[PDB]
Symmetry: C5
Subunit: 331 residues, 5 copies
């Protein structure tokens, strides 16, 4: 739905069940993790000269974001955007912090429909502050790769941490495409070799979903494009050439999606031709068994007049052959 | 209709019933409001060092605009545009004043048709001069948010006032889209599960209305794009990063509209396929009940010749099965 | 047709009936007007330090243009373009003169067809030299607005005179669009509620005419775009911000035309669906009155065998109801 | 076909019949012309301080081009491009010479098919070296305009000579368009008023040919665009403003072609609608003469039962009117 | 499939059968060749001041690439891209080495389906390091042109070697297009003159394959575009103007592909019209032989009533002519 105030703090999303603030402060050497539901127990991490990750799951608490935002020096309107989930993904560069809004998807296979949660990211000094609206994410491997010190996460700084969550979120889209490639694959057979009923409505659902998809990658692609040209906190030849290979991913997604929305585009045209081909066969059979049985039931019509038996049957049986011969141009 | 003079002051709109000049002069502390129908009782507000809002409802009085425009130093041709409602939304930057033309819509639900009133805005010093052609608007909350000193309107200057009316007008489009999303939603079912008559003409009305819509957002989007790059009176880091949030909105509108005009685009193609699928079933039934009843009425045709009863009925009843079996490739 | 010389002076147009040289020399204070058919009686106006308008109606006289062009210092090839009417509208900037080619249209309502005359304009010092191929134009109001000293025409210079003829020519297109909006309006009803014969050929005529139109606005739009960026003789803040409000017009035209060529584009698709809907009804009626009258004429077929009367009529009349009931899924 | 060496001199074209080297050396005062089939008798023209035109007709002699190219200092790979006719038109600028590749067409009217010969041009000092693969060209008027000293060809230099052959080649395309405008004109009637058989395959031939065309103007347009921005040997205000009026032509071609490939694009859609309109009439007639003659042959079916004459004929003749009346909604 | 680690070395391809490291070190004077399956026996070639070509066939050995990459100073993530075959072709420029990823195709004629192997190229000093996933390639002529010292390969440096493999790989695409031009050619006849069954599914396969194709040339075209603008190791006027004539090729491919995906695009529209033309003929025949034999079997229906012989046959035979005459508007 919509708002009508001047720039307040309303939450438009519809996930009012969960609230769980997780934090992962780490150095080149160490880390902890906890799940406090207290607001204040995370504010002292602003000055921690070591990479923190203050994940605030459950945005519906406008009051929680209001406090954290007033403390971290976050602008009043850039908080509103965190709460307003009906927004195109963007990157906002500021004097202190980099602000990113992203959306991650869930495709219900079978029940052809996709659902969208909006994740906000604020990068400031050594804090990648996060905002989810519901419990559960695709950021499970990244926190696990900090947990069992796997790879080059602990070794590197705090801005690199952002370019690890963003890899994890973009990587998820590769799953969605995989589900849809395998979707099309089937709902395409359903047009060649299954000309039934709700195959059409299943096809229109796909275009609908693909448009819905497209108009959330094409912007998310621009985020990593705009996150590439500029960047204040970057550590040039460390974190920049890294996400070149996430902005590379962000392209392949919105390139794959443009393939799907180009195959599915001309799929209903396959149907209409496949169907008009069937309504040729049926049409044809009707015209045959009415050019052998409509001429003959006319002969056997006159000879019911009230005013050689094998002379009429011979001349009927010969016409039913001057017919099935003439119908060798048509078969 | 059209004009043929050199740059005079003709009103092309067709709303000749209302005339009501409302003013809202306000400071950091106070305001008044009145509804004078006198022209002169608003001219002394040009020098009021406090944010005024001189709303002139009912443009049809060419004489009223002529006077106010001659007083405020407004160019002769930029007044003509205020009266000529058949014009693409634009922003005109000048030495003294910023000139903006906008259009706001009304979608008659049921009676599938949309109507357009054109609102002009002139920003000069501490005056946001307004021009409506009919009584009633979506600027009710903004004047109410000044009225009961809600939010940061009174606190800020006069150029910010403009970027509050413009938020209010752009926000209205979110209602129109909501009405059309919920429109498509229904007039799409009407193609999957209701293949009737005036469903087609209702679909063409939508494309017509969407084109009509599109070609008034895409320019209105450019207004807030061009109102972003430049700006003389702006108060940089106060009013500029505000309407970035509104030019952000202006995008999402013309992005949502591009979704609608991409779903509806390939909707008549759903119909034509759904219909050619029905004219397969009907076509098929005709070809069956004419390949069991046209062969048999031929047998019972010869035996009306004037020249075992269960031998003919057995051989007819067997053929009416060599048929309903052969029709298991087709069902 | 075509030429094959090196850059001579051939007239490709097909209007060989009229020749009438009109001139309107004017100052801040006075003017005259005459219709001499003599070539030489207009050449002394080259040095007249007061705005002249040397309209040469009837270009077919290659000799007339040859003389005037040799006198006014006009390049040999830029004269050829004046005579060669089969050319895209352009603006040519030179060391002395600005050269503009424009086309103005005539839409024969009813006889769905549009016709094109090409008007050339050369602006040099205080002379806007004109070239029409046939008598009669849309420049009647402009010469009348000089005649009865209406508006700011006499007051201003000679380059402004150009940006008054060009307003008058561009303004004409607003009439053409008005005729075509009202055309579509009707030839659209002719697809919803009149599925006849030459409705299709009338629709294809429109796309043809719209393409023909489009590819003469899109360049004419670029003329006033290119006439905006540069300009040697301009009188900056006098004549420049004037035609901004003609290049504004030039946009709205090629924006309106892009609406028409987007409604008409998907209009034949309305037809094909409306028609395939009719060939469903007809198709359906045929399948009904052949599943009540083909089964029953089979019963009344056996009982014509030569080898209770209300027992057969009751069982026929019951089947003709087990049918009209089963046909409540289909109505 | 294709090659597999490193940059040798293979001729891919299929015109192995002709070989005829023509030369036209000329000054401000005189010229000669000859048709030597000897290679060496043209090499001394490299230093002739007067405009030469060394036309080498019949490229299939790889050896001839190899020698001339080794003498004139032409790069090894830029010769390959002269022999390889399956290439997009381009302009190659070099330290000494300008290299241009062009294609000129032949449209077999009736036998709907177009054929392509590739002409190469090398401009060096006072030599416009030419390369044709077959005898005969559209360069007949240009050599004739040198021959009888017509126009400003002899008067001007050698780089201007190039911009005379190129005018002659581009001008040819105006003939092709003329043949296709007049083609469409007919093969469009063939869709409104001739719904036959191979009208469809004739329409697809046109799109095929238009795509084939388009993708040889759009590059040839870029040649004269790129031949406009730069140019080393140009003689600025002599030869440059000349071919501006050939790059102007090059536009109108690829603009006309974009009209054709926009009319023909939606022409098969005219057909499909015109045809589905006929398969309405036919469909309709079938449903009538089976709702007057299928109900009545049922009445006259019962009265053939073996178990007032104008009472049955009156009630049959009345139903055959309760029918032809009900069929006034449908006619 | 997909990965979930931080940037390790997983091989996504599915060709786990071959492993064969071939090397071709050469100077202006000599070369050797061998097929060692040992990893270490190729590492000393890093410093060989003479052009080496270290082809590593069979990427599935992650360990082999890991070692060679750690030795040659190759970044950890740019190795991952060598193993991850599901990636868009790109060129990566670095401080030491140029990194290129390319894909080469195999089109199974008949079994309408195309298969893709990914070839990686790393250019460093005098080493063009290669990475194939399966045995066999189109690089047979290039190694043969080194082998029997053909052309200018041995004569030139090591960066030129890259622009010989890349010519060989791009040249292969000319074969694919040749197979598809000849494919369309046939599967187009199959729409004009063969309106059968799986012609539709064969057409959709083509669009599918063409999209699949297009979205691997359009990037491969950009590789040679980006490999043209920049280049650190280039030897300017030696290796640069060479591959201009490969980036020229890279264009013609993605221009030819855009022709195919523009002919095939409107091919199903040929079918649907060709078919709706047949379902006119069939439809028509049915309506004839039911307007001569449905009226007459009505006459011979009344005269079976139980309540001049050549008077009825004359009046039936005359109506069967008032019919076949009326059907001269329809034939
Ligand atoms: Ca708001
Ligand atoms: Ca005007
Ligand atoms: Ca916002
Ligand atoms: Ca279509
Ligand atoms: Ca010419
Ligand atoms: Ca006349
Ligand atoms: Ca205006
Ligand atoms: Ca009978
Ligand atoms: Ca080659
Ligand atoms: Ca080449
Ligand atoms: Ca010209
Ligand atoms: Ca990853
Ligand atoms: Ca990568």
């Amino acid at each position: 739905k919509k708002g009508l105030p001047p720039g307040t703090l309303v939450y438009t999303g519809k996930y009012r069940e969960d609230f769980e603030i997780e934090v992962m402060n780490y150095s080149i050497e160490e880390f902890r993790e906890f799940k406090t539901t207290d607001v204040e127990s995370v504010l002292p991490f602003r000055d921690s000269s070591t990479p923190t990750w203050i994940n605030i799951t459950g945005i519906h608490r406008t009051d929680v974001v209001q406090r954290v935002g007033e403390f971290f020096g976050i602008h009043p309107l850039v908080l509103e955007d965190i709460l307003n989930v009906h927004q195109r993904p963007k990157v906002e560069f500021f004097e202190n912090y980099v602000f990113i809004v992203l959306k991650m998807f869930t495709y219900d296979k079978n029940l052809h429909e996709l659902e969208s949660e909006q994740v906000s990211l604020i990068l400031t000094k050594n804090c990648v502050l996060m905002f989810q609206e519901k419990i559960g994410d695709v950021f499970d491997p990244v926190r696990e790769r900090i947990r069992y010190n796997r790879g080059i996460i602990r070794k590197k700084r705090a801005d690199y941490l952002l370019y690890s969550l963003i890899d994890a979120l973009v990587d998820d889209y590769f799953v969605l495409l995989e589900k849809i490639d395998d979707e099309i694959d089937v709902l395409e057979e359903e047009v060649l070799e299954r000309p039934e009923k709700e195959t059409v409505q299943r096809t229109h659902q796909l275009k609908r979903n693909l448009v819905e998809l497209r108009k959330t990658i094409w912007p998310l692609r621009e985020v990593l494009s705009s996150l590439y040209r500029d960047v204040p906190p970057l550590i040039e030849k460390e974190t920049v050439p890294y996400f070149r290979d996430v902005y590379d991913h962000t392209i392949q997604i919105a390139d794959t999606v443009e393939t799907f929305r180009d195959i599915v585009s001309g799929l209903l045209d396959v149907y209409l031709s496949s169907v008009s081909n069937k309504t040729n066969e049926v049409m044809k059979v009707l015209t045959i068994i009415a050019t052998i049985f409509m001429p003959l039931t006319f002969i056997a019509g006159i000879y019911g007049m009230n005013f050689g038996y094998p002379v009429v049957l011979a001349v009927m049986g010969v016409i039913a052959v001057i017919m099935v011969v003439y119908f060798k141009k048509k078969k």
